[model samples]
Target: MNKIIIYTDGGARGNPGPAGIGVVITDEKGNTLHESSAYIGETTNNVAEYEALIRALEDLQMFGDKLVDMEVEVRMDSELIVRQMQGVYKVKEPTLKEKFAKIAHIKMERVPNLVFVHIPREKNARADELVNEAIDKALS
Candidate 1:
């Protein structure tokens, strides 16, 4: 319904250990619209990153009709995922390519205006913490 900006991050306790996804969606004015995270069991950091992006897109489905005219921008800390999702880099890994396909379906057919941005770690602090928190739930 409104122009939105989103930040997402994902990480694992170990390379392929317990994983989680963190996402924060906000209005163009920087007001938070929604924030969420999920524990996705055992997965690697790369797939986890893609999961976060998909989770964010899936979360948008809740708005139903309101999303028909929404513009979206996604910012993330993972340059690799960002590039791969944009076709700048090939999604060589099978798992990540599957995730990329899901994301492409969403971006291409679901939300065509969705833009991807790659950011450094500092700009993604909040989302990073969300990732850690969700992953911690698995350990707990």
Candidate 2:
């Protein structure tokens, strides 16, 4: 089976201030396959994080049937989001529950082989850079 690795990050200037999302997709050899950076307007960090993952999965839909034959690993710095997805934490936030529903749908329908991993902030620099770039671009 083929393998794909994804890194995603999201941030807000404040707890619920200007927010942005970034995603990086790569092959097993670390070849860059795709990247996305976008300002998601105003939202909390957790919401932005979920948005980043959702956008990445939606973008992967372009791969069509190829995704079904691939094992995908998604890395993110948000331990809360990672643990929530892994069933280790309960999603009690109303907005987060809504976002989680979208992820559940995508995982069940398109990304059956999806795995979520939590990484440290330093390791997710690229994605974090993209997030800041997006916010800067939007503010400019």
Highest TM-score against the true fold, candidate: 2
Deviating ranges (above 4 Å) for candidate 2: none
- For residue 43, what is the lDDT in candidate 1? 87
TM-score of 2: 0.94
- Estimate candidate 2's alpha-carbon lDDT, on a 0 to 1 scale: 0.90
Compose the digit string of candidate 2's lDDT tens values, residues 1-140.
Answer: 26889999989999899999999999999998899999999999989999999999888997887776789999988888899998898999997898898898888798787899999989899999999999999999
Which residue pairs in candidate 2 have backbone atoms (N, alpha carbon, C) closer than 3 angstroms, thus clashing? none
User: What would the C-alpha RMSD of candidate 2 be, to one decimal place?
Assistant: 1.3
What does candidate 1 score in Cα RMSD to the true structure?
Answer: 1.4
lDDT of 1 at 137: 74
Regions more than 4 Å wrong, model 1: none
Q: Encode model 1's per-residue lDDT on 1-108: one tens digit a residue.
A: 368889999888787899999999898889998999789999898878888888998898876887878888999888887888778988787777666877898788
> Which candidate has the top score in lDDT?
2
